[PDB]
């Protein structure tokens, strides 16, 4: 399937234990996709003060369209030193590894595998 329905745990930035997916744009997009497949991916909502508390390169989910079965359609865009790899819509947040942090909410998304 070109798209997969996922329910991502929304984590508070200060709870996150592993604050990024790796060291290159290609590695972070790779690892983010693997963690989304394995159900070990969390989401941090981007507000003032959040990104400096996380590790670059960043992986964003961005809205790819205007929402089947409650699931917003999204795609991945990485960012490193202010350059973005991918072009998409509004940020829904920044992806991080999930290693058992308690969420505050769940965000239903339809991910373009
Ligand atoms: O089942 C969730 C899932 C499965 C495969 C891929 C491949 O990219 C992704 Br992303 C997410």
Swiss-Prot record:
Superkingdom is: Viruses
What results from changing residue 37 to R? In strain: Omicron/XBB.1.5, Omicron/EG.5.1
Q: Where is the CoV Nsp1 globular domain?
A: 2-113
Residues of the region (Disordered) are 1-113
Where is it located?
Host cytoplasm
The protein's job, in short, is: Inhibits host translation by associating with the open head conformation of the 40S subunit. The C-terminus binds to and obstructs ribosomal mRNA entry tunnel. Thereby inhibits antiviral response triggered by innate immunity or interferons. The nsp1-40S ribosome complex further induces an endonucleolytic cleavage near the 5'UTR of host mRNAs, targeting them for degradation. This inhibits the integrated stress response (ISR) in the infected cell by preventing EIF2S1/eIF2-alpha phosphorylation upstream of stress granule formation and depletes host G3BP1.
This protein is called Host translation inhibitor nsp1
């Amino acid at each position: 399937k070109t798209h997969v329905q996922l329910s991502l745990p929304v984590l508070q930035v200060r709870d996150v234990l592993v604050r990024g997916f790796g060291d290159s744009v290609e590695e972070v997009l790779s690892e983010a996709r693997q963690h989304l497949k394995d159900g070990t991916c969390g989401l941090v909502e981007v507000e003032k003060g959040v990104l400096p508390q996380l590790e670059q390169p960043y992986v964003f989910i961005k809205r790819s369209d205007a929402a089947p079965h409650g699931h917003v359609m999204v795609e991945l865009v990485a960012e490193l030193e202010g350059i973005q790899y991918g072009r998409s819509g509004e940020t829904l947040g920044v992806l991080v590894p999930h290693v058992g942090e308690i969420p505050v909410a769940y965000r239903k998304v339809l991910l373009r595998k």
